[PDB]
Every structure is written in structure tokens, then in C-alpha cells.
Design a protein around this ligand. Structure first.
Ligand SMILES: CC(C)CCC[C@@H](C)[C@H]1CC[C@H]2[C@@H]3CC=C4C[C@@H](O)CC[C@]4(C)[C@H]3CC[C@]12C
Ligand SMILES: CC(C)CCC[C@@H](C)[C@H]1CC[C@H]2[C@@H]3CC=C4C[C@@H](O)CC[C@]4(C)[C@H]3CC[C@]12C
Ligand SMILES: CC(C)CCC[C@@H](C)[C@H]1CC[C@H]2[C@@H]3CC=C4C[C@@H](O)CC[C@]4(C)[C@H]3CC[C@]12C
Ligand SMILES: CC(C)CCC[C@@H](C)[C@H]1CC[C@H]2[C@@H]3CC=C4C[C@@H](O)CC[C@]4(C)[C@H]3CC[C@]12C
Ligand SMILES: CC(C)CCC[C@@H](C)[C@H]1CC[C@H]2[C@@H]3CC=C4C[C@@H](O)CC[C@]4(C)[C@H]3CC[C@]12C
Ligand SMILES: CC(C)CCC[C@@H](C)[C@H]1CC[C@H]2[C@@H]3CC=C4C[C@@H](O)CC[C@]4(C)[C@H]3CC[C@]12C
Ligand SMILES: [Mg+2]
Ligand SMILES: [Mg+2]
Ligand SMILES: [Mg+2]
Lengths: 163, 96, 145, 132, 96, 48, 48, 145
């Protein structure tokens, strides 16, 4: 009941996912167990933990697919646009991990979880590989070593997707 | 974990992060806002308290009844009753 | 038409029951397969534009490697390693990690996941064999009707 | 009270008695019998078609309840009732005394399944016929 | 030998053509049950013999019986398809 | 019933019932989703 | 109909007999009987 | 002559008991094998007159593929695909579905049916081991006689 928030319990994965992708087409035609109506539905549906979990899943899935595409496609002689997007994405992830460190029940409670350890290894691997590439972007050997580190990055990203 | 996490996904969570930092800066330094919550009335608290005590007594009565319907307890009860029955017959024979 | 038989019919109902365990195994394997396939394909060809062949390379060898066809001669040839000892004297030192990644992967897929699937099949078998017999007896009337 | 419907007027005294047992159970707060009858969406004869006074004062008649239970079993339940055998003109018939009992028992058993009273259900099931 | 013979006759009668019929089902069931009981008796008496004097029990199991056509009791047991009697340690010791 | 007279029990299970819309009892049992009744040896013998 | 009613009564009698031969029912019956036995002894001692 | 031994004799009786489960597995596998073999042989050679070689092609690779010999180099060579990546740059686009059909088939045969057979063997083993010991004790007298 806490998971689904102010939503009905008969809602399926596909219904909430479809409502997430189509906000203005699925929310009026839904049951929730104008200024007074639309704002209330938007504030109730997207504050639910289930919706946040689905958003985090989809986000991590895109991260895995986009990062997988980035490591399969060849690196360019300068820092590419997809590399900058992934850089912004992993700083964001690092800040989210720091926020989790501050608001947990101690450093020990956060480091006990295996997914937090996977998150730290993930962020660390990406930054080594990126700085390895960014030190000399036109160097072929730097690109090869960077992709070698980023192979380990992709396996952990997909292992971290099992959460 | 997902109750306290911001809703905005991973790339776009930087906006949520700077918004939370803005709220902390505006509450520590600026002090233009505070935190608001809701406190339960005494009527619903005593209703929950009354409900919990009634169900505690109800469970103990059901638990006591269930433990008395077990085979071991019934055999033990039967044994003690027959022993007390002979005590009563020791009184019959004495009087006779 | 196997459902009439007292041996083949309940086993078909049980096979349809074990399909959920097979699906569970598929969901767990997809992680290890995609992670290893993208990583291994990237290590073998680190300076190639992405195409449909890259995607085919990500799925073909990883999936078939869970059935004992390891493609080590093909992987060694693709790695451009010219030494007599496999995955030695290569042009790039990163591609020498492919046998290791593979070493982790088949430990994850064959040693761990396949044996776990055997355990799930045995437990599932003991739980729902009598229910399959009962369901077969209802399907006997269904076929008769 | 007198009713214009010929099906309701054909009903014997014990049918009205079973209707009284439904009414007494239904008047209790948050009773599932009242909820079942309201969510059934049928008229006084139980037909699925969805006279307000007739629809509320005699909402728990046996024919309507038979239709509700009929929809609960399957799509082709249709219990055949014969209330003409309780008239005094059929007293000379030999086996009728069993039949008059059995049918009656059946109706009460249905009531006992509705209120989930297993012991009376088992007793009326034992009194009547077609046990299995 | 009589208990083994009794078990065999009841087992053969329970699947015989004279006992098939809609009204004879419980009778048939009873026969199989009684057969099983007699088999248990044959095992039990045999076990008692092996407990008291194993060598004399071996002599008993090896004795050809004039009634029953001079077959030893183990031959009778095999012919009666008494799996329980043949699997008993006394019978197995005599066979070894 | 199957213990007392199997053939008469088979006749009982095959009898169309005027009340209940002329469906045999096995049809009633299938419609009631009674798995225990359908798996019984008497019912299976009638189906065979 | 006669066959089905007779077998219904026969099953209920067999079922009742089987439930009375269970260990739990016999222990319960023994317990209630000893309690009633002391009630009868409360009458003996009173009269004595 | 293994039947005299207290270890090998009951195991031989149990092996004869497990042969029915083996036969059940054979009946279930025949479906997947014939369906995949006719389909795969047709995709590889779609413009050939039917002969005895067509029938031999329908049974040889499908049956041996359930034991880990996947014949992927041979299948790739037979498909007339000239690309470095397997089953790419082929003359016909339909023959590129052979690895997929195969992908379904060994999922059906090795992942599903073989593990189901392991479950049937374990259940069968627990059910009839004591009966095998009793039957071995009767066969002891049979061998002595
Ligand atoms: C799972 C995580 C913790 C593993 C982290 C270790 C990985 C990222 C590191 C540790 C040692 C590293 C290797 C060390 C040296 C070389 C030789 C160089 O010529 C190419 C890169 C290569 C081959 C490196 C690739 C990346 C590497 C394998
Ligand atoms: C933390 C767990 C996963 C263990 C990690 C072990 C990894 C980092 C080790 C195991 C085997 C190692 C490789 C073995 C040999 C060579 C050849 C050498 O000339 C360059 C480094 C390279 C290519 C190594 C890179 C690091 C390596 C891949
Ligand atoms: C009991 C089991 C788990 C033992 C594990 C054995 C591991 C440590 C072995 C098995 C296969 C090995 C690999 C085989 C070949 C190569 C290529 C070579 O150029 C560098 C080392 C490397 C990459 C080896 C690293 C160590 C390795 C992964
Ligand atoms: C099991 C059932 C539902 C599957 C149905 C899908 C099958 C029959 C269809 C769907 C897509 C189809 C393919 C789509 C396009 C091509 C490319 C063409 O140059 C050759 C035929 C080929 C390769 C088709 C073969 C048949 C095909 C695979
Ligand atoms: C419904 C279940 C069985 C899934 C069906 C998926 C089938 C229809 C898919 C999966 C892989 C697909 C093939 C993958 C790639 C190619 C090459 C392309 O140039 C022509 C179509 C072709 C040959 C596809 C045909 C359709 C295909 C076989
Ligand atoms: C966890 C498991 C079940 C993952 C399943 C992987 C599936 C989707 C993979 C594994 C092998 C793959 C096939 C391997 C090679 C080819 C030939 C190519 O020309 C078209 C695609 C095709 C036909 C692939 C389709 C997708 C495929 C069937
Ligand atoms: Mg974390
Ligand atoms: Mg192999
Ligand atoms: Mg009756």
C-alpha cells in the first residue's frame, strides 16, 4: 500500500509504465484510490515510490544501452557528444551516491549494501576510462586502454541492473 | 529507499540536487521557510489504542483455547483429573 | 495427442509448468550475456563503426558458449594473436583479457545458473507433479467432450 | 401486501418465510447479502435488465435470489421450481410428501449457503435429495 | 507355508474372473488386505524362528514338504510371488 | 456410491438432471471447477 | 434417487464412525467423561 | 554377472526402470528434432529435389546438436555466407534464420528437456530404489536356482 501510494492496488507494471510515458493520455482515464484535478493527479502519481522505482529502472536501462553503444562504437579524435552526456550522467550518479552517504544511517549501513559497492566501482571505472581517453584523445593506444577499462564498466552496469 | 529518493531520473537528477541544495541554503542562511507536517488527533490515537488492547486480549483468549485443544495438554489434564479423582475416592472409602 | 497417454500427458503439463523456470533462467542469463557480449565484442574490435554486424557479434558467440561450443580458435584468430600459445603476441594488450572475461562468464552461466536451474526444476517437479496428474484427469474429460 | 405480478402471487407461505430470513439478515450494517442484491443489477423477478416501491419492499424474494445464485454458478444454471404442488388438490398423489419436503429443503439450503452457516446447510442438504 | 498359500489364493482370487462385478468391489479390496495380512504373518513367524534358532530355521526353510509336492518353502514363496518373504534377512541368509 | 454398485453409480453420473438444465453431474462438476471430483477413480472410470 | 440417498446416509454413518475412531476425538471424549465422572462423585460424597 | 554384487545389481534394476523415463524424453524430443530438422534443412537447401540425403540431413545434425556439437562452422559453410561475422552477407536472406531456429531448439532440448529428465530421474530414483533392492533379493534366489 505504501509502494503504490495514492494509486489503486490493481495497477500493473505496463499500466504505470504507459502512464509514465503518456502523462496527458492515461491519467484522466485512471482511478486514484482543471487546477484542482490535473495538478492533484500529477502531484500524487509521481510522488509514489513505485513510479520513482520505474523511472530509476528505465533510466538505468537507457544508461546501460547508451553506454553499451558508446563502448561498441569507435572513439573519435576529440571528446564526442555521447561522452559529454555520459560524463554529466555519471557526475549526477556520483552526487546521488554522496546524497545517499549523507542521508543514511552511517557510512557502515551504506557500504553494507552490495549495490552501493557496485555503484562506487561503476563510477570509479568510468572516470578512470574517461580520463585515460581525455588525457590524449588523438592517441590510438589511449583509446584502446580506455575501451579496455570501459569493458569492465559495461559488465558492472549490467550486473547493477539486476537490483 | 524509494520514498526518500527524488523522482527525477539519473541524467536529470542534477536539477533535483540543486533544488534540494537551494532549499537547504534558503532554510539555513535565508530562513524564509520551514518544515510542515501533520499530527494525529487524540481521538484516533485512543481508538487505535483501544483496538490494539482488545485484539491483544482476543488473541490471548484464542491462544489459550488453542493450547487447551492440543493433544498433549488434554492427555496431561486427563492424567491430573484422574489423580484428583482417586483423591476423592480416598475420601469416599474413608467415610465408608 | 500425447495427452491421452498416462506417461506423456502429465509430463507435457509439467513441461508447461517448467517453462516459467526456463523464463526465470533466461532473465538471469540476459544480464551476464549482454554484459560479456558488449565487453568482449568491444575488446576484439575497438576501432570499428557500429553496424548490424556489431549487434550480431554481441549475441551469437555468448549465447552458443553456454552450450559448450567455446569458439576459442575463432576468438584467437579474431584477436590477431600470432603466438603458438593462445592469446599471446597480440597487437593490443587489452584483447588478451577476452579469455578471462569468458572465464568469468561460463563460470557465471554454466557452473552457477544451469545448476541453479536443475535445483529449481527438481523443487518445482516435487511440488506440482500431483497437481499435474489432477489437471491431466480434468483434461481427460475435456478431450472426451 | 398484494402484488400485480402473477409469479410473486403464486409463491407459498414458506417462500415468504425464507424472504423474511433474508430481510432480517439484510437489515444489519455492512451486510454482504444487501451488497450482493444491489450489485446484481436485476429487477424483482431476477432477470438481468437493471416500480421503485416493488423493487425495495420485496427485493429479497426467492426467485430473484435463485437468479443471483444461478449467475454465481455458471452461464447456464436455470433451477426449475414447481410451486403448484403445495396446493391442497395434490394431496392424493403418493410421493408428493417427499417432493414438497425436498424442494423446500433445497431453497433453505441455498439461504444457508448464502449466510455461510455450514451446519444448517449440511442438515438441509441431508433432508433433501440430489446430494452430490 | 499355509500363510504364503493363503496370501497367494486371496491375491489370485482378487483378480480372478469370478470376482469381477460392480457389487464385488469391497469384497475384492478385503481379499487383497487379508492377503497382505497373511503375508505379514508368514514373515513374522519366519522372523521369530530366525530369532530363536537360526540353524533350525534354516533346516525348516530347507525341509521338503510331503504335502505341497516336496517343494521347499522358499520355492513355495517364489511361486506365491511373496516379495516380502524373499527380501527377509533369514531367507536371504539361507539363499547365501 | 462407487463402493456399493459401480454400474448404478455410473448410471447416476450419466443421468441428465431436469433441475439444473439437463446437464449430467460431471458437466456440473467441470462447470464448478471441482478438481477433486474430476480426479476421483469413479468419475475417471465413467469418462473412460 | 433412492440409491443416492441410501449411499449419502451410509457415507455419513461411516464418516461419523471414522471421526469417532480418531485419537484426538477419543482423548477429548475421555477428558469429558472423566469430568462428568467427578460430577457423579460430587454427588456420591454429598450423599455420604 | 553384475547382479551378484550388492552395488551393481540394484543399479542395473534401476537402470532398466529409468529406461521408461529415457523413452518419455525420446518421445518429447522427437517433436522438436523433426520440426527443427525439416525447417533447418529446408532453409539451407531450398531448391533441391528430395532424396535420401535430405532425410539424412534432417536427422544427423539435430540429434547430435543435443550433445554440444553445434556444427556452426559446417552450418555457416553450408549457408554460403561469406562474411567475417557468421551468417552475414549471404545469397538468400532466409538462411540467416538458421542460427535463431537453432537458438530456440537447443533452448528447448538442452535447457528444458534434459533438465526435466534429471528431475524425472531423481523422483523415479527416490520412488523405486527400495523396490529395486527387494527385486534384487528375489533375483538372488533366481540366480542361485
Ligand atoms: C572489476 C574491476 C574492479 C576491475 C578493475 C581493473 C581493470 C579496470 C584494470 C586493472 C588492470 C588494468 C590493465 C593494466 C595494464 C594494461 C596493459 C595496457 O597495455 C593495456 C591496458 C591494460 C590491459 C589494463 C586494462 C584495465 C585493467 C584490466
Ligand atoms: C576483481 C576481479 C574481477 C579480478 C580482476 C583481475 C583482472 C584485473 C586481471 C586478471 C588477468 C589480467 C590480465 C593478464 C595478463 C595481461 C597481459 C599483460 O601484458 C597486460 C595486462 C593483462 C591483459 C592483464 C590485465 C588485468 C587482468 C585482466
Ligand atoms: C578453479 C578455477 C576457477 C580456476 C580459475 C582459472 C583462471 C584464473 C584462469 C583460467 C583461464 C586463464 C586465462 C587464460 C589465458 C589468458 C591469456 C593470456 O594472454 C593472459 C592470461 C589469461 C587471460 C588467463 C588468466 C587466468 C585465467 C582466467
Ligand atoms: C511463429 C510465427 C508467429 C512467426 C511468424 C513470423 C515469420 C513467419 C516471418 C516474420 C518476418 C518474416 C521475414 C521478414 C523479411 C524477410 C526478408 C526477405 O528477404 C526474406 C524473407 C524474410 C526473412 C521473412 C521470412 C518470414 C518471417 C520470419
Ligand atoms: C514469435 C517468436 C518465435 C519470435 C520470432 C522472431 C523472428 C520472426 C525473427 C527473429 C530474428 C529475425 C531475423 C533477424 C535478421 C534478419 C536479416 C534481415 O535482413 C532479414 C530478416 C531476418 C532474417 C530476420 C527474420 C525474422 C526473425 C527470424
Ligand atoms: C538469454 C537468451 C535466451 C538470449 C537469447 C539470445 C537470442 C535473441 C540471440 C542469440 C543468437 C542470435 C542469432 C545469432 C545470429 C544471427 C544471424 C544474423 O544474420 C541475424 C540474427 C541472428 C539470427 C541472431 C538472432 C538473435 C539470437 C537468436
Ligand atoms: Mg547507491
Ligand atoms: Mg561440448
Ligand atoms: Mg437426502
Amino acid at each position: 500500500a505504501d509502494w503504490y501510494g495514492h494509486l489503486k492496488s490493481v495497477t500493473s507494471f505496463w499500466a504505470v509504465l504507459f502512464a509514465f510515458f503518456f502523462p496527458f493520455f492515461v491519467l484522466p482515464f485512471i482511478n486514484f484510490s482543471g487546477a484542482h484535478r490535473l495538478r492533484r493527479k500529477f502531484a500524487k502519481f509521481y510522488s509514489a515510490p513505485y513510479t520513482r522505482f520505474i523511472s530509476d529502472l528505465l533510466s538505468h536501462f537507457v544508461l546501460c544501452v547508451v553506454t553499451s553503444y558508446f563502448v561498441l562504437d569507435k572513439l573519435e579524435d576529440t571528446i564526442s557528444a555521447i561522452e559529454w552526456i555520459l560524463l554529466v550522467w555519471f557526475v549526477a550518479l556520483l552526487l546521488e551516491e554522496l546524497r545517499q552517504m549523507i542521508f543514511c544511517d552511517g557510512i557502515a549501513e551504506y557500504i553494507s549494501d552490495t549495490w552501493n559497492r557496485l555503484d562506487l566501482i561503476m563510477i570509479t571505472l568510468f572516470f578512470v576510462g574517461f580520463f585515460t581517453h581525455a588525457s590524449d584523445p588523438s592517441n590510438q593506444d589511449s583509446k584502446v586502454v580506455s575501451k579496455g577499462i570501459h569493458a569492465f564498466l559495461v559488465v558492472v552496469l549490467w550486473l547493477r541492473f539486476m537490483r | 529507499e524509494y520514498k526518500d529518493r527524488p523522482f527525477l531520473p539519473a541524467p536529470f537528477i542534477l536539477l533535483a540536487h540543486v533544488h534540494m541544495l537551494f532549499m537547504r541554503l534558503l532554510r539555513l542562511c535565508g530562513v524564509h521557510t520551514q518544515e510542515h507536517e501533520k499530527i494525529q488527533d487524540d481521538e484516533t490515537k485512543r481508538k487505535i489504542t483501544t483496538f490494539e488492547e482488545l485484539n491483544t486480549d482476543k488473541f490471548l483468549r484464542r491462544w489459550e483455547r488453542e493450547r487447551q485443544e492440543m493433544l498433549e495438554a488434554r492427555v496431561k489434564m486427563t492424567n491430573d483429573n484422574v489423580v484428583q479423582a482417586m483423591g476423592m475416592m480416598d475420601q469416599l472409602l474413608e467415610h465408608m | 495427442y500425447y495427452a491421452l497417454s498416462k506417461n506423456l500427458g502429465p509430463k507435457l503439463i509439467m513441461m508447461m509448468e517448467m517453462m516459467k523456470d526456463v523464463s526465470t533462467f533466461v532473465f538471469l542469463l540476459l544480464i551476464f550475456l549482454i554484459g560479456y557480449g558488449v565487453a568482449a565484442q568491444s575488446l576484439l574490435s575497438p576501432d570499428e563503426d557500429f553496424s548490424s554486424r556489431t549487434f550480431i557479434g554481441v549475441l551469437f558467440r555468448p549465447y552458443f558458449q553456454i552450450y559448450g561450443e567455446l569458439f576459442l580458435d575463432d576468438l584467437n584468430s579474431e584477436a590477431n594473436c600470432l603466438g603458438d600459445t593462445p592469446f599471446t603476441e597480440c597487437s593490443r594488450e587489452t584483447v588478451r583479457m577476452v579469455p578471462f572475461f569468458l572465464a568469468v562468464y561460463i563460470l557465471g552461466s554454466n557452473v552457477l545458473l544451469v545448476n541453479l536451474l536443475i535445483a529449481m526444476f527438481n523443487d518445482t517437479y516435487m511440488k506440482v507433479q500431483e497437481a499435474a496428474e489432477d489437471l491431466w484427469r480434468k483434461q481427460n474429460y475435456e478431450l472426451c467432450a | 401486501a398484494k402484488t400485480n405480478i402473477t409469479a410473486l402471487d403464486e409463491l407459498p407461505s414458506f417462500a415468504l418465510a425464507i424472504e423474511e430470513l433474508y430481510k432480517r439478515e439484510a437489515k444489519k450494517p455492512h451486510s454482504h447479502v444487501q451488497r450482493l442484491v444491489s450489485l446484481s443489477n436485476t429487477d424483482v423477478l431476477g432477470r438481468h435488465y437493471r416500480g421503485r416501491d416493488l423493487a425495495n419492499t420485496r427485493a429479497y424474494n426467492v426467485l430473484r435470489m435463485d437468479q443471483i445464485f444461478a449467475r454465481l454458478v455458471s452461464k447456464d444454471f436455470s433451477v426449475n421450481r414447481d410451486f403448484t404442488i403445495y396446493d391442497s388438490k395434490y394431496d392424493k398423489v403418493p410421493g408428493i410428501q417427499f417432493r414438497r419436503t425436498a424442494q423446500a429443503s433445497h431453497m433453505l439450503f441455498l439461504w444457508a449457503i448464502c449466510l455461510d452457516r455450514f451446519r444448517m446447510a449440511r442438515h438441509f442438504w441431508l433432508i433433501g435429495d440430489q446430494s452430490i | 507355508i499355509n500363510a504364503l498359500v493363503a496370501s497367494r489364493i486371496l491375491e489370485r482370487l482378487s483378480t480372478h474372473r469370478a470376482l469381477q462385478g460392480p457389487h464385488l468391489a469391497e469384497e475384492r479390496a478385503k481379499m487383497q488386505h487379508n492377503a497382505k495380512k497373511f503375508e505379514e504373518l508368514a514373515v513374522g513367524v519366519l522372523g521369530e524362528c530366525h530369532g530363536s534358532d537360526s540353524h533350525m530355521a534354516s533346516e525348516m526353510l530347507h525341509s521338503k514338504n510331503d504335502m505341497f509336492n516336496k517343494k521347499n518353502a522358499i520355492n513355495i514363496a517364489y511361486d506365491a510371488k511373496s516379495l516380502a518373504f524373499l527380501s527377509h534377512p533369514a531367507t536371504q541368509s539361507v539363499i547365501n
